[PDB]
Amino acid sequence: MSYNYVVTAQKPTAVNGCVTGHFTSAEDLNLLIAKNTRLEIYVVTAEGLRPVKEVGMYGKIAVMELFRPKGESKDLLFILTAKYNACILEYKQSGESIDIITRAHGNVQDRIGRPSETGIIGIIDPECRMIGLRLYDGLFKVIPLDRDNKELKAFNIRLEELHVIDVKFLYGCQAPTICFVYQDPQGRHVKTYEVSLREKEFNKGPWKQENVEAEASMVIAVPEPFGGAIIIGQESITYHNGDKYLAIAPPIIKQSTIVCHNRVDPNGSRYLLGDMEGRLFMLLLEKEEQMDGTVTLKDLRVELLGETSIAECLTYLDNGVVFVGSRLGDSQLVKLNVDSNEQGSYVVAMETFTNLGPIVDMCVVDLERQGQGQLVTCSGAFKEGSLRIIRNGIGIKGLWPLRSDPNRETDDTLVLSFVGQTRVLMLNGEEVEETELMGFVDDQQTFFCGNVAHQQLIQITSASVRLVSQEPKALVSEWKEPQAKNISVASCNSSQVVVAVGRALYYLQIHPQELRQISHTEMEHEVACLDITPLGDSNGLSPLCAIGLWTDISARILKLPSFELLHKEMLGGEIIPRSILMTTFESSHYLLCALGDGALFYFGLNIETGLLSDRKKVTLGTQPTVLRTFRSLSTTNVFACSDRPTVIYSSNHKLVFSNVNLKEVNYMCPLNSDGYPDSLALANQKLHIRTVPLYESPRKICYQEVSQCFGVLSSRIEVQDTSGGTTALRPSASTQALSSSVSSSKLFSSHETSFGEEVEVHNLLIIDQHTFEVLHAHQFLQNEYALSLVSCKLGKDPNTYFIVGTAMVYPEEAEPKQGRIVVFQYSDGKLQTVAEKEVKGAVYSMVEFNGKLLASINSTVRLYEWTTEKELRTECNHYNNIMALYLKTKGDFILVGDLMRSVLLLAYKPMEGNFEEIARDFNPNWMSAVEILDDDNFLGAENAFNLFVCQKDSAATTDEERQHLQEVGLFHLGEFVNVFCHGSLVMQNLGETSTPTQGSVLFGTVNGMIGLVTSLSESWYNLLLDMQNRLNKVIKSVGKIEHSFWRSFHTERKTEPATGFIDGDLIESFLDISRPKMQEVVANLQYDDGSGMKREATADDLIKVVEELTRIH
């Protein structure tokens, strides 16, 4: 059995291209960005970048532009995905219903043809007549824009030039005219063609071919005032227009090559060009008029503006601001100031959209030190690599829950706090000051206060009853101090106010139209807030007077007037929680009392009965229920808050354990002010991100709990100059470290570079778990690339060791030949080496097997034993592989990967000592990631954005038949998966109580998606696949694209449909449709629970199932 469920915890956030136009309406600009498949449209406004819609398409969006045909007000959008599917989208809005309609959908994949090396290029005629696609090598797809072509019937034109490096459109031509730069054995040339749809061929072209430089990157289309084409490449900027060949070689563009570009001035008087290193160059077009009417170009200029993120998208929105889109870094909203500043650069950032980027590795750690797991990844690359931390959630002690002012709020009453007193100051905004005034008593300090009825408020003061207000204006019912008893385990509500003044007391509910004598019987149980909490604001009758008491916790429900006598069950519970929480959706009220003494009662309150509940026995301390309320929406519930950390989700009668974003909650609740959405009230978007910038690209990360440290491999790129050996480029975290160390391997001593060469130096950084500051940065040797890291316990040695494998790399050789396996110990402050163990090869990935160690030398799986004399000794070898890249272990099973071969599961032989080959997969896969799910299922992630799971079938005969593993399940994730890990964001225990999560596995991809993979049962999988197929039949796709077509396995040669893999966004879209759509689906479903009983297909019964499925999300 291997039936897997895959879901997406966090959406991808790596920008793949940007457009700007009047998409939503003809009066506002837009910013449309499609990260990997998720397409978000932002409407440009004064408040910032307000999102208006995000959609999920079944395909990796690759070609994106906006075109405005004649006869249409708002311009349509053309989308081409990585599965060769073309869609034309239009923004349709009717008052509030926002939807995107597909005016023309089609499939443009050709059975024959080689895919292009650059990728996929889409071009639009400036007058919006036809669509040009550079899909396959040697072909040029052309789609007419005639409205009868709803099915997108295109035609392919054959051109003589095969290796076309770029193709774009021209300007000012009556007929559709394109220009392309191409590579031939004679060099790189630029040629123009006049494409005509009437003859369906290519004409001669406006101007002849011109020999451009050997490194022409891409072409820029200059608008009508100047026309022609712009060719930018490494060390060259040229302008070609008929008889004009104005070319310059600026000395500033020499460092790197331009990647992205955009046009700012509508007439074409200014351009922005990106760079590989993040520099944002600007291109100036100097114009001049000759005689009358004719305008030509004077000269070209380039200028450096500043440094930005790693530029893959550049767009100019409005008012001198630029959207800097990034693939390996966070996106930026930079501002182009007219005047410069210090360290002169006209680029100043305004907003930073977080991007997970190329997640290389990840690991699960426990900062809380309880036993649960939080993710930490080595995000980013090049100069902007960081250490972003992903977690689950949603000395400032004490809050202001008094939302007295309906709109002004801020701070009007300084309600300051100590033991059994009252500090209430009149404030003007958040101005708080330690200027004690004698007008109001200030030696007192408040816990709580309340209102009674008809705003006959009470000025609680020991001196005199001086009501500073206009409504009551009387000395009636001041909160007296019979024994100097201020709020000391005391409280009051608002609908009714029951106090305990001394011991004999006339019920203080004597207010205008609020008269009652119920708490007149002598109460022997003085409660903090002895009262009832109504079901809304009902008063004057007795709809539900049954509340109960928690002093003895009896089945009898004690109403307030009774106060009877029962068995003396005064338990040890006296510790106070924070609150019990008003939290439900529309109409369901429950009573999850905080009975943390034992048998935590998460009552699913049946109002009438309230008998029992699903009890989760969490044996914690002495914590009874404490009544407290803060209100945010139409909510009526409470919350069990026992001693050992318990943070819950809102459910019917069950519970989960999670984290609140605040790291300390004694008397805490955040604000409701909606002023700053970027800087939220998150003290320290369901998953929260904490960013620690290292200013250098990390490679591998591991955690040690004995010293509570993070060991991270990192690579720093420095320009190598002969004057001084090597000079740094930017100050990274390695240079700005508290300590430093340089490796010294005397036995392993074994070229020269130029002044313009660059050197990648690999370092190991030790980072504290609390402050996340670098402590020690051990620097490796020259031409030393480090490719592994593991903190492990070896043999009988009580110490834990950081083991790093590394290899020499020289520009001459293609494969490393010599390497080493270095062992470090972190005693205090300094990393001390122990052993070197020089190995002729290249270490790739190392995992602690069973107290010994296993290596991943090229074409070699070796076992090393940590002897008593502190050195590694070889134990056994296995050479039946090309070279083992990624390796995972579980028990006695060693899942060995290969870059072009397949799963190579090996079994250790304790009696023999050498490895054996139980089975091996015999298919070509081009593997990229390996994981072992269970004792039988082995899962892998590919280089062509694919997922698969194979099994070691035990039904085969006692022969070579069992030596084969068949691909049980296949899936097309559509993303380049990079790392697999074990854990979950939910509290990681007690998940076997019929919950459909049999083993949770995280995966992190290159584009920055966190994903969950779990296992189900056979009946669960069959029901779930059937319901998914029914929903796919019922629901309408965003771009008229089939879900099964998109999820089907698709390599370069095989296109078998996806089997044995339940999808994640389609399953969770069931909760995002209207009730008639719930009735359209599940109309004749079975909903098999046992074998054949209870076949009714209740919509709520499937809603509960989907909720249980999305609990692990």
């Binding site: 200028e303 409005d318 008012n319 007219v338």
Partner: peptide, 19 residues
């Protein structure tokens, strides 16, 4: 005074002149 950054095209002034 410099022409490379001068007179950028603008919509209504209350577009990016707040917050």
């Amino acid at each position: 005074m410099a022409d490379f950054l001068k007179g950028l095209p603008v919509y209504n002034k209350s577009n990016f002149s707040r917050f």
